[PDB]
RNA sequence: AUAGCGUAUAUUAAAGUUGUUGCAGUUAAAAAGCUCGUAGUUGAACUUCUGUUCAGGUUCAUUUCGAUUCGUCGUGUGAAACU
RNA sequence: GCAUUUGCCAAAGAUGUUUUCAUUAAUCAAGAACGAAAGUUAGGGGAUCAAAGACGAUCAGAUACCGUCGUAGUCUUAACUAUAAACUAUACCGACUCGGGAUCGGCUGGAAUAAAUGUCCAGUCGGCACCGUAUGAGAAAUCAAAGUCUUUGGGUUCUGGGGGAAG
């Protein structure tokens, strides 16, 4: 039962847009990739993990997946889970052999 | 009442820190070394520093000492500590498995991997 | 300012608990609240022990002098004054199995 | 004693969204709870949901992403004439710009907006934003 | 199960990486396979292998290695992790005494600002993790069944009790990082013995 | 020594003119400890017409007492607000035995505390977001403040203190509600500030889609940082 | 403040210090010593779900277009909740 | 409020049910059953303590703390009385939000032995609690509720509105 989660990412995020179709929003916060919360200016503990892409020779491609996680999630110790699953849905975990 | 103070121990730390290769178990040597190396306003002071630094040379000869990090001597000491036999302990081709370990391997299906001896 | 969560007495799941007279004074105190220590001492000073063990008629005694058994129950005022229990800092205050 | 099944299911829901939970088991359930969910889903907040038939009342698993800031019930279910709409949208909702107050009407259960477009009103159920 | 992978799991088993104490932080419920008659808690090794590789991929990801920081308290992983930092060109906490403020206080002498942090026992090294929490710094931890996962991003289930275990974990991670960095062939065996990382008495 | 030598990685990245805008720092949620980084983005060349002029205001100065070894030892606390009327605000406070000291330290504090207020629309969305996207709440000590969005030109309806904060934030139009002991000025100020901060915490419906995935400045600029200066 | 301006008293906001919206009740004033119980207030889930086709508008979007003009109109095509 | 043995009498929870009924329920002005101690009425009883009282001592004064006595009381039948810091100073029914061992009562498997109304292990339902912890609450002390409250409404009784005057 994945459907809503997928549709959620289907379209891009937009700050405030007036009728003249400007973007009014000073910056577009990163949102957590698990809980989907907003990443604070002030968030002491919010984290962005970059994980490398691997060619069949073991080579790093220089390509990176970035997984953002938010303070409440790491803090509750959900992180070690969230990450793994975020890597499943992106097709990067488990690691093939 | 022979307890030694802040100034003196900071001093001694520094003097060993930079100079350890120059320094001797002899007080009378180290005091002259210090005199050349540093600005010490007192005879008495210099001597206290030299004495404590000597003391710490002796303590260093015996082993590790808190507060002083001599990186050259520590890396030499590190290379010292390595010794490797050819066989290791770790034999890939022969490995021993408990009963319970075996049960978990059954769970993963790895129970039969080459070179596994049950106990 | 609730001081203790226990409120000093070990009693829960009941309305009422039997009251005991304090050894030292005799004041009635709650059996939960009471500072109770069981004491097994010897009736006699070690020196005095030597003296008596000389004179014991029956040589078939191996530690053949009885111990004195006391169940000692103190009201609070008494067990504080008498140092059986003494004032401790807030954090330690909750420590449960302390001795040696 | 259970009063207001919509209230149970709604509060349990919000709780699990708030705890960052990925899904909710919801029990027991009614028409109204399912129509309310069909409403929140249609409107973008919850995701797909599944209904489980135990021979009695029922159970409902709800996939949530996270969107819901709050979703409440109002009890008692007051009477909300078209005149009073202003009150309730100002009192209950975070801003004019979004969020819904759901109502039962003789024309069925509606976003308060659906009510202006259907020109009716009168029984307040809950809200979500 | 390639020959490579079989060698990996053999090494891991032999080093007794899968033996845990008896407590289960429930946070670990997923990483633990068997619970024994003797109370010994047994880790699924596949999870271990997977996580090692994942970790290596996080470390390969930081551009400049000195921005990865290994932190160890206990005596076993002092040796092992200083060797790790050696082959991995990253920073080591050598002194078992982690100074409060190391990540937080830009004024301290030990002051660091890594991109990624690696800790040996989340329970022992806890102050490091707590500090990382103040700075937006992600964490790879070596984790036994008794270990708290609060503020831990990558869990590698291990036995962080023994030298054998810790050392060969840091070793395997190092070898895989080497591979990913093209400092080593994927097919080729590594001439560095695990025995280096063991703690000498 | 009027030249700033950065003690922060971010400090280097800022002084050497690498990180583009302030809001960007806010975006990647990079902790600002250095009260220089802020004066950077606000240039002191003094062109009188910019709304990006950075403003400092002392709000409170308190004679705080201590009973110490038979003496009664006084210090001063002070509260300071910093803001450009455009989107950015900070609040700080400091205790010191000399007044102008408390003031300077509190200015520094307030700068370290810079925060991105979000500006929304009340009714139909036309030109300048004159208010907040939602209703939100500050909480400090006993005190509570609720900020409710107001229609165009309503102006700031709020007590002298939170009014001052809000004006520094550049919220033009707002409705206020306050609970608690509000005469505790530090708690009132704090509350208003935290409230203003929660604007960006709220997930409004327009934030729903997939965000951009970027690399942190530090990963991009890694080459720069590892040159030795 | 200003041809007005002080003062006293009742009453309104200030008051979320009467609270339906909307308050408090471990220690600031505040849960009845405890049960039964009538008035009162309060009450679990299920019933024509649904799908297919037509039309009328009403909205929406816009790589459909147009006409003119300082913005409406006509038209697409699909997309909605309707009726 | 309840702690000696045994027998009798009615009662109770939890658990166990692929038993039956089928909304019969929640809370509650009226109205009722209880309700420590002390106290009251009419009989008993009277060992211990022991208000009042009598004395010793102490003291400037002690009609007090200490000591020797001692009545009512303390115990008991029938009756009244209705009150306590009658205290978790925390209303009842119902959901939902963390982790961990242990404990009392059922049940369900499993294991050891000297083979059982006993051990141990793993479940689980219900109790009394405890220990961590909250990116939940609070003025705080603190609170796994005192949480799911300006993002304010699950059901229902009760109580408070500066201090005294004054229960
Ligand atoms: Mg009582
Ligand atoms: Mg007020
Ligand atoms: Mg009082
Ligand atoms: Mg009904
Ligand atoms: Mg009588
Ligand atoms: Mg006299
Ligand atoms: Mg007597
Ligand atoms: Mg059995
Ligand atoms: Mg409150
Ligand atoms: Mg708090
Ligand atoms: Mg607790
Ligand atoms: Mg309320
Ligand atoms: Zn006593």
Output the DSSP codes for F113-143: T-EE---B-SSS--SS--B-SS-EEEEETTE
Contacts of F127 (CB under 8 A, 6+ apart): A18
* E156, E141 Cβ separation under 8 angstroms: yes
Nucleotide of closest approach to D7 (CA, C1'): H154
Q: Rounded to 10 degrees, what is the CA torsion of E188, E192, E195, E198?
A: -110
CA distance E170 to E121: 13
CA distance F67 to B32: 52
**β-bridge pairing D49-52 and D59-63:** antiparallel
- B104: tokens are 């978990």
* Helices and strands (H, E) in chain B, number of each type: 5, 2
The distance (Å) linking the CA of E118 with the C1' of G77 is 58
Residue A66: closest C-alpha in chain F: F213
CA distance C26 to C29: 9
Angle CA(D56)–CA(D62)–CA(D68) in degrees, nearest 5?
130
Contacts of E121 (CB under 8 A, 6+ apart): E72, E73, E74, E77, E142, E144, E147, E160
Question: Which of B64, D45, E101, F133 has the alpha carbon at shortest distance from A16?
Answer: F133
Between the CA of residue F30 and those of B35, E8, F5, F26, F99, what are the distances in Å? 49, 39, 19, 7, 31
**β-bridge pairing D49-52 and C67-74:** unpaired
F29 vs E contacts (CB less than 8 Å):
136
User: Out of D69, D95, D96, whose CB is closest to F203?
Assistant: D69
- E55: tokens are 């970790």
Task: Tell me if there are at least 3 CB pairs under 8 Å linking chains A and E.
Answer: yes
The distance (Å) linking the CA of F102 with the C1' of H39 is 69
- E32: tokens are 């633990």
Q: Does the annotation list C89 as a binding residue?
A: no
Q: Does the annotation list C25 as a binding residue?
A: yes
F122 vs D contacts (CB less than 8 Å):
96
Between the CA of residue E139 and those of E61, E71, E149, what are the distances in Å? 14, 11, 10
Q: Does the annotation list C78 as a binding residue?
A: yes
CA distance F160 to F153: 18
Residue D45: closest C-alpha in chain A: A4
CB contact under 8 A, A27 and F23: yes
Peptide bond preceding A94: is omega within 30 degrees of 0, i.e. cis? yes
Strand G close to D105 by CB, under 7 A: no
* F134, D95 Cβ separation under 8 angstroms: yes
Question: Which of E143, E26, E152, E150 has the alpha carbon at shortest distance from A76?
Answer: E150
**β-bridge pairing D108-111 and D79-80:** unpaired
Output the DSSP codes for chain E: --HHHHHHHHHHHHTTTTEE-S---GGGTTTEEEE-TTS-EEE-HHHHHHHHHHHHHHHHHSSSGGGEEEE--SSHHHHHHHHHHHHHT-EEE-SS-PPTTTTT-TTSTT----SEEEES-TTTSHHHHHHHHHHT--EEEEE-TT---TT-SEEEE---SSHHHHHHHHHHHHHHHHHHTTSS-SSSPP-S-GGGTSPP-
Residues 22-51 of F with CB under 8 A from E: 29-31, 33
Q: Residue F155, SS3?
A: coil
- B79: tokens are 């290379």
Q: Rounded to 10 degrees, what is the CA torsion of E137, E139, E145, E148?
A: 0
Strand G close to D31 by CB, under 7 A: yes
A21 vs F contacts (CB less than 8 Å):
none
Describe the crossing of helices B43-62 and B6-19 by its angle, rounded to 10 degrees: 60
Buried b (16+ CB within 10 A) or exposed e, D66-101: bbbbebbbbeebeebeeeebeebbeebbbbebbbbb
F127 vs A contacts (CB less than 8 Å):
18
* F13, F217 Cβ separation under 8 angstroms: yes
What resolution in angstrom units was achieved for this structure? 3.7
Q: Chain G bases under 7 Å from protein CB? A: 15-16, 21-22, 26-27, 42-47, 81-83
Cα of D83 to ligand 13 centre, how many Å?
Answer: 75
Peptide bond preceding E169: is omega within 30 degrees of 0, i.e. cis? no
State the DSSP code for C66.
P
CA distance F30 to F8: 11
* E90, E133 Cβ separation under 8 angstroms: no
Sheet holding F136-140, edge to edge: F136-140, F143-149, F174-179, F156-157
F143 has which bridge partners? F140
CA distance A35 to D20: 5
Q: What distance in Å separates residue B115's CA from the closest CA in chain E?
A: 9
* B66, B56 Cβ separation under 8 angstroms: no
A32 vs E contacts (CB less than 8 Å):
none
D97 touches chain A (CB under 8 A): no
Residue with tokens 């934003």: D129
Contacts of residues A55-61 at CB distance under 8 Å and 24 or more positions apart, as own/partner, are A57/E186, A58/E179, A58/E180, A58/E182, A58/E185, A58/E186, A59/E180, A59/E182, A60/E60, A60/E61, A60/E180, A60/E181, A60/E182
* B45, B53 Cβ separation under 8 angstroms: no
CA distance A63 to A54: 8
E42 has which bridge partners? E19, E34
Task: Tell me if there are at least 3 CB pairs under 8 Å linking chains A and C.
Answer: no
Strand G close to D119 by CB, under 7 A: no
Cα of C24 to ligand 1 centre, how many Å?
Answer: 26
Strand H close to F73 by CB, under 7 A: no
């Amino acid at each position: 039962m994945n459907s809503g989660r997928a549709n959620q990412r289907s379209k891009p995020m937009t700050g405030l847009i007036n009728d003249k179709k400007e973007k009014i929003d000073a910056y577009l916060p990163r949102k957590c990739d698990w809980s989907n919360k907003l990443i604070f200016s002030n968030d002491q503990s919010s984290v962005q993990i970059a994980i490398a892409e691997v060619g069949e020779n073991g080579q790093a491609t220089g390509s990176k997946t970035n997984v953002v996680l938010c303070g409440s999630v790491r803090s509750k110790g959900e992180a070690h889970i969230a990450l793994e699953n975020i890597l499943r849905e992106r097709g990067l975990y488990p690691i093939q052999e | 009442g022979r307890v030694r103070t802040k100034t003196v121990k900071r001093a001694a730390k520094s003097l060993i820190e930079h100079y350890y290769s120059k320094l001797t178990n002899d007080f009378h040597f180290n005091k002259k070394i210090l005199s050349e190396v540093a600005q010490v306003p007192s005879k008495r002071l210099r001597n206290k520093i030299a004495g404590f630094a000597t003391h710490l040379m002796k303590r260093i000869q015996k082993g590790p000492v808190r507060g002083i990090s001599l990186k050259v001597q520590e890396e030499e000491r590190e290379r010292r500590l390595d010794y490797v036999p050819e066989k290791s302990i770790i034999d890939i081709e022969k490995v021993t498995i408990d009963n319970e370990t075996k049960e978990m391997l059954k769970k993963l299906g790895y129970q039969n991997i080459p070179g596994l001896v049950s106990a | 300012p609730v001081k203790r969560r226990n409120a000093g007495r070990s009693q829960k799941n009941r309305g009422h608990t039997r009251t005991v007279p304090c050894t030292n004074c005799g004041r009635q105190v709650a059996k939960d609240k009471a500072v109770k220590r069981y004491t097994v001492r010897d009736m006699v000073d070690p020196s005095s022990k030597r003296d008596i063990q000389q004179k014991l008629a029956f040589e078939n005694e191996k530690q053949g002098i009885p111990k004195l058994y006391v169940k000692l129950q103190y009201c609070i005022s008494c067990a504080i004054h008498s140092r059986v229990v003494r004032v401790r800092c807030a954090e330690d205050r909750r420590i449960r199995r302390p001795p040696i | 004693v259970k009063v207001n099944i919509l209230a149970e299911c709604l509060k349990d829901l919000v709780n699990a969204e708030k705890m960052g939970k990925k899904q909710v088991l919801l029990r027991p359930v009614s028409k109204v709870v399912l129509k309310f969910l069909r409403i929140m889903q249609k409107n973008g907040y919850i995701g797909e949901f599944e209904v489980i038939d135990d021979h009695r009342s029922k159970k409902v698993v709800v996939e949530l992403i996270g969107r819901i800031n709050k979703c409440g019930v109002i009890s008692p279910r007051y009477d909300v004439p078209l005149a009073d709409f202003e009150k309730w949208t100002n009192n209950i909702l975070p801003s004019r710009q979004f969020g819904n107050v759901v109502l039962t009407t003789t024309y069925g259960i509606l976003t308060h907006e659906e009510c202006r477009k259907r020109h009716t009103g009168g029984k307040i159920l809950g809200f979500f934003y | 199960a390639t020959q490579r992978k079989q060698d990996d799991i053999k090494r891991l088993l032999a080093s007794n990486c899968h033996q845990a104490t008896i407590n289960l932080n429930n946070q670990m419920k997923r990483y633990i396979s068997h619970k024994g008659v003797n109370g010994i808690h047994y880790i699924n090794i596949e999870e271990t292998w997977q996580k090692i590789k994942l970790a290596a991929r996080v470390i390969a990801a930081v551009q400049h290695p000195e921005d990865v920081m290994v932190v160890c308290s206990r005596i076993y992983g002092q040796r092992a992790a200083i060797k790790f930092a050696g082959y991995t060109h990253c920073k080591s906490t050598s002194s078992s005494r982690w100074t409060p403020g190391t990540l937080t206080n830009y004024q301290t002498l030990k002051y660091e600002e890594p991109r990624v942090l690696i800790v040996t026992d989340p329970r022992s090294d806890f102050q490091a993790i707590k500090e990382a929490s103040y700075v937006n710094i992600p964490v790879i931890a070596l984790c036994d069944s008794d270990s708290p996962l609060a503020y831990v991003d990558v869990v590698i289930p291990c036995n962080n009790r023994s030298t054998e275990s810790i050392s060969m974990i840091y070793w395997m991670i190092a070898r895989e990082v080497k591979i990913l960095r093209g400092e080593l062939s994927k097919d080729e065996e590594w001439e560095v013995m695990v025995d280096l990382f063991y703690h000498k008495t | 020594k009027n030249d700033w030598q950065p003690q922060t990685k971010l400090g280097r990245l800022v002084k050497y003119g690498k990180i583009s805008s302030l809001d960007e720092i806010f975006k990647y949620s990079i902790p600002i400890k250095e009260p220089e980084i802020i004066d950077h983005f606000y240039p002191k060349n003094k062109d009188v017409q910019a709304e990006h002029k950075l403003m400092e205001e002392v709000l409170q100065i308190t004679p705080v007492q201590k009973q110490t070894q038979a003496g009664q030892r006084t210090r001063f606390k002070g509260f300071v607000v910093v803001g450009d009327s455009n989107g950015h605000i900070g609040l700080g406070w400091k205790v010191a035995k000399e007044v102008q000291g408390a003031i300077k330290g509190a200015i520094t504090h307030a700068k370290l505390n810079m925060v991105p207020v979000r500006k929304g629309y009340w009714g139909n969305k036309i030109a300048n977001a004159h208010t907040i996207p939602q209703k939100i709440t500050g909480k400090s000590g006993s005190v509570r403040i609720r900020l409710v969005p107001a229609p165009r030109g309503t102006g700031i309806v709020a007590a002298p203190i939170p009014k001052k904060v809000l004006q520094f934030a550049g919220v033009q139009d707002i409705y206020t509600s306050s609970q608690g002991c509000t005469r505790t000025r530090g708690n009132f100020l704090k509350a208003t500030y935290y409230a203003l901060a929660n604007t960006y915490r709220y997930l409004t419906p327009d934030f729903w889609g997939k965000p951009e995935d970027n690399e942190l400045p530090f990963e991009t600029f890694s080459e720069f940082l590892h040159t030795k200066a």
